[PDB]
């Protein structure tokens, strides 16, 4: 109930209820108020499940892509971090849920679940995946 499943449970608890804010989620006030961007959301979901993916103030997609172990796209598993080329290389991150979906915090929908086959996310995905819990 920890680790991967715990992070999915915490992160999902606020789906549909947490608008995105670029740069948010790197102060305790923002965390308490559920104000995050894509990478500070992922850091918080895992921290709330007992897993340290980096410092509160300094975690970004660039630091997260350096955590854990590389995974081939064909082998992506629930809990793996999936990265996408949105405004820059690896500019977006989410937590893969299985079944071609991922939990993430994005401008359009805030904290939400998106599909890897949505044409936008399919085009933006380049195969960059990181496993952070074994």
Binding site for Cl ion (CB under 5 A): 47
Question: Is position 104 annotated as part of the catalytic site?
Answer: yes
Question: Is position 52 annotated as part of the catalytic site?
Answer: no
Q: What is each CA distance from 113 to 15, 28, 55, 109, in whole angstroms?
A: 8, 25, 25, 9
Query: Alpha helix (H) ranges present in 17-131?
Result: 28-32, 38-47, 61-65, 119-124
| Residue placing its CB nearer to Cl ion in the complex, 36 or 121 | 36
CB of 105 to Cl ion, least distance (A): 15
Catalytic pick among 33, 38, 90, 99: 38
Question: Is position 109 annotated as part of the catalytic site?
Answer: no
CB of 44 to Cl ion, least distance (A): 5
**Residues involved in catalysis:** 38, 92, 104
């Amino acid at each position: 109930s920890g680790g991967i499943e715990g992070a999915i449970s915490v992160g999902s608890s606020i789906v549909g209820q947490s608008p995105y804010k670029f740069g948010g989620g790197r102060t305790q006030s923002d965390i308490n108020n559920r104000i995050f961007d894509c990478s500070s959301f992922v850091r918080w979901a895992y921290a709330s499940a007992g897993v340290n993916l980096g410092p509160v103030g300094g975690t970004t997609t660039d630091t997260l892509v350096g955590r854990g172990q590389a995974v081939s796209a064909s082998e992506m598993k629930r809990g793996d971090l999936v990265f996408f080329d949105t405004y820059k290389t690896n500019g977006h991150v989410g937590i893969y849920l299985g079944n071609g979906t991922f939990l993430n915090d994005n401008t359009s929908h805030g904290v939400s679940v998106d599909s890897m086959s949505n044409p936008y996310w399919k085009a933006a995905f380049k195969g960059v995946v990181r496993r952070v819990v074994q």
